RNA sequence: UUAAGUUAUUAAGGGCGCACGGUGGAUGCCUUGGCACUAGAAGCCGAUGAAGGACGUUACUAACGACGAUAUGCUUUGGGGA
RNA sequence: CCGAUAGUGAACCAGUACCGUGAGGGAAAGGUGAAAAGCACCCCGGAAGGGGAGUGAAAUAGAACCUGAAACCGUGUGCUU
RNA sequence: GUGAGUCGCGAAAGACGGGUGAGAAUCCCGUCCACCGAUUGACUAAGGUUUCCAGAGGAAGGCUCGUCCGCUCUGGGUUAG
RNA sequence: GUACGCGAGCUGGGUUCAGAACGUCGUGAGACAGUUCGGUCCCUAUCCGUCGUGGGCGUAGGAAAUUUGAGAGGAGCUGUC
RNA sequence: AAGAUGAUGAGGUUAAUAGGUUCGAGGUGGAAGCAUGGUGACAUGUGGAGCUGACGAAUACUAAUCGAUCGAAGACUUAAU
């Protein structure tokens, strides 16, 4: 367990970060939030290997109701993408891809920043 | 609170205005001092 | 609440034997030929933590 | 030989700069560039500019090389003091001091 | 190698001295303004519109002076000599 | 008699800025050099600022510009802890 | 100067990406998220007096940074039988 | 006993502020030998002291472990059957 | 496992340090869908089902990379071999 913020706002912040990282496959953040969203998104790639309806009814909670995506002028929803695409790369592997890179600090707040990716 | 000096024009271009002063003896004297002393403004 | 006395030029300095700051970790790059800080990224050229895995 | 360079009226206090200097005094140039260029503070950009500027003037004007160049002495001194004032309770004031500085670096090689 | 005895080296930092700067502006020197006075003149202005002021006027124009829609000045009479 | 904390409050764009509803009260602020000859040009720098080169007898006189003290702050160092 | 690099930084939910730029937690763009909703909405009076809009700039102001502003510079805007 | 301990640790009920009232004394304003309803308690800890805890140096070479214990602190009560 | 910070301790690829995965404990207490019985609200089966933060083993898939700093060569005097 770990605290960035209050209860609610933390949670929604994590549905947000984890909603991203798949839209973009990597982001730049402070280290702490990357650790927590790592745990989450690890659990979601563990989910999207199974692929049952119920699995969608568990990825529904955390991930958002929609966030549109276009690669080839295509319509996706960050859910179709997950169970349809992502896990189909890392089936032969366990969950637990995500890696972290202690990039550098930040002039404003002195906070360490990183580049967490699933690529 | 509502502090003193809730401002307004009419009560300030009245009382402290000119035509009051230059319609009263004492006020004429007042102006005499604010002239003798030199000032860039009167009735204020 | 308050001081009663003037803090002299000595104690004001002895008190400041600890506002120094530490020599940060450093090492040359493995194939970017320059210095950076440990268990971190280079910020240059192509990123070199074990070699390039990034652009920025 | 000798060499130097200056920055004036820089909008930082002496002390905050002076620490950063105490991470410098004695070193070789390359290192000190690195040391400044990494630490996440507000003075590091400035001192970095002034240092490398000094190496610039040394190179062009005096025709030195870069290996043996070392930081003989460095120090920041007090500057003009833009007095301001922040209001404060009970009908009063308090005069802030927006301070300044005059940074001094003297690169040297040590030889002739 | 043994026991006993003694004793300095350290300066993270500080004090005494010596130097070099920075800060801020006293002193020194000077006057662009004033204080107090002597001799002499003058001691009022205004409904034929004052004193004092507003708004404007310049090739470009914010302010002081100067001037007032004939407006950053007009004519005359003298003086003066680029 | 004063020679910029004096002397008019006012040597400078002052009965101003400013304060107050208003009567009214009331500031701080002089000096480059002989002459603006007020730093062409190169270099770092985003700039500012600076090092150089030059004007000048002198630019540690370079515009916050005569002289530049003390407080205060530093850098190094002989002795010492 | 000391106090002190100490108290404070003036109720509050933001995050990510892409640009810019010398340089970005704070600037623009979007997607998501959260908040008020007899209102943090819309319209006028009193009041203030050019704060309004465009284009540039960032010395100081902004309680941080600032490539931005209600700050500066230039220019421009208010129409009645 | 220790400012009838301790308010830069707390309260603030009476009492020592302003109001009002009862008995009273006073010609009167007002005052008690008294009584009664109510009534604003600020201090961001410099030094010493104290509770805990890290640096530097020393213990005639440098290190890791174990441990002696001159001294100091603590415990110290008591019923019934 | 200790923690305000610093310290203490477990650990750093020649590895199980933390995360994740797979098992497990414990906890909650019969997931969803499906069918069946119901006019429906709802029940039964599929099923001690599904879920699961901190606890327990295993599992190098990811993260502790490559690295730099500091630290001795043992003074004299006696008395001993
Ligand atoms: Mg003087
Ligand atoms: Mg961004």
From Swiss-Prot, chain A:
One GO BP: translation
Sample GO molecular function, one term: structural constituent of ribosome
HAMAP family, alphabetized: Ribosomal_bL17
Protein's name according to its UniProt entry: Large ribosomal subunit protein bL17
Organism: Staphylococcus aureus (strain NCTC 8325 / PS 47)
Coiled coil, from the record: none
Keyword Ribosomal protein found: yes
Any one Pfam family match given in the protein's UniProt record, by short name: Ribosomal_L17
Homology family: Belongs to the bacterial ribosomal protein bL17 family.
Curated annotation (Swiss-Prot), chain B:
InterPro entries reported for this sequence: Ribosomal_bL34, Ribosomal_bL34_CS
Residues forming coiled coils: none
Keyword Translocase: no
Domain of life of the native organism: Bacteria
MF (Gene Ontology): structural constituent of ribosome
Entry's transmembrane regions: none
GO biological process terms on file: translation
Family in the record: Belongs to the bacterial ribosomal protein bL34 family.
Protein name: Large ribosomal subunit protein bL34
UniProtKB/Swiss-Prot annotation, chain C:
UniProt-listed GO biological process terms: translation
Alphabetic keyword roster: Ribonucleoprotein, Ribosomal protein
Family: Belongs to the bacterial ribosomal protein bL32 family.
Lineage, top ranks: Bacteria, Bacillati, Bacillota, Bacilli, Bacillales
Entry GO terms, CC: large ribosomal subunit
Protein name in the entry: Large ribosomal subunit protein bL32
Xref: Pfam families: Ribosomal_L32p
Keyword Ribonucleoprotein: yes
Gene Ontology MF term list: structural constituent of ribosome
Keyword Heme: no
Swiss-Prot record, chain D:
InterPro entries for the chain: Ribosomal_uL22, Ribosomal_uL22_bac/chlpt-type, Ribosomal_uL22_bac/org-type, Ribosomal_uL22_CS, Ribosomal_uL22_sf
Keywords, comma-separated and alphabetical: Ribonucleoprotein, Ribosomal protein, RNA-binding, rRNA-binding
Domain of life: Bacteria
GO cellular component: cytosolic large ribosomal subunit
Entry keyword annotation includes Ribosomal protein: yes
Gene3D superfamilies given in the database record: Ribosomal protein L22/L17
GO BP term (any one): translation
SUPFAM superfamilies, per database record: Ribosomal protein L22
One function term, GO molecular function aspect: rRNA binding
Pfam families named in the record: Ribosomal_L22
Subunit (UniProt): Part of the 50S ribosomal subunit.
Family: Belongs to the universal ribosomal protein uL22 family.
PANTHER family in the record: CHLOROPLAST 50S RIBOSOMAL PROTEIN L22-RELATED, LARGE RIBOSOMAL SUBUNIT PROTEIN UL22M
Role of this protein: This protein binds specifically to 23S rRNA; its binding is stimulated by other ribosomal proteins, e.g. L4, L17, and L20. It is important during the early stages of 50S assembly. It makes multiple contacts with different domains of the 23S rRNA in the assembled 50S subunit and ribosome.
UniProt protein name: Large ribosomal subunit protein uL22
Species of origin: Staphylococcus aureus (strain NCTC 8325 / PS 47)
Name of the gene encoding the protein in the UniProt record: rplV
């Amino acid at each position: 367990r770990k605290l960035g913020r209050t209860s609610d706002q933390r949670k929604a912040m994590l549905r947000d970060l984890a909603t991203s990282l798949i839209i973009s496959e990597r982001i730049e953040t402070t280290e702490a939030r990357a650790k927590e969203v790592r745990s989450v998104v690890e659990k979601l790639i563990t989910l999207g290997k199974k692929g049952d309806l119920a699995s969608r009814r568990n990825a529904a909670k955390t991930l958002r109701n929609v966030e549109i995506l276009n690669e080839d002028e295509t319509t996706q929803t960050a859910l179709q993408k997950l169970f349809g695409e992502i896990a189909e790369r890392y089936t032969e592997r366990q969950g637990g891809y995500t890696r972290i890179l202690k990039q550098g600090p930040r002039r404003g707040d002195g906070a360490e920043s990183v580049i967490i990716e699933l690529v | 609170v509502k502090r003193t000096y809730q401002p307004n024009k009419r009560k300030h271009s009245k009382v402290h205005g000119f035509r009051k002063r230059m319609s009263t003896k004492n006020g004429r004297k007042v102006l005499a001092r604010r002239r003798r002393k030199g000032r860039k403004v009167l009735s204020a | 609440a308050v001081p009663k006395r003037r803090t002299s030029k000595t104690r004001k300095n002895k008190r400041r034997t600890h506002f120094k700051i530490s020599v940060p970790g450093m090492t040359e790059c493995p194939n970017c030929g320059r210095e950076y800080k440990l268990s971190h990224r280079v910020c240059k050229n192509c990123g070199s933590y074990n070699g390039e895995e990034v652009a920025a | 030989m000798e060499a130097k360079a200056v920055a004036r009226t820089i909008r930082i206090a002496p002390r905050k700069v002076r620490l950063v200097l105490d991470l410098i005094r004695g070193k070789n140039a390359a290192e000190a560039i690195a040391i400044l260029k990494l630490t996440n503070k507000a003075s590091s950009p400035v001192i970095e500019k002034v240092l490398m500027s000094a190496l610039a003037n040394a190179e062009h004007n005096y025709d030195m090389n870069t290996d043996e160049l070392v930081v003989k002495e460095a120090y920041a001194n007090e500057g003009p003091t833009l007095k301001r004032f922040r209001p404060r309770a009970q009908g009063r004031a308090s005069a802030i001091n927006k301070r300044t500085s005059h940074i001094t670096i003297v690169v040297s090689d040590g030889k002739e």
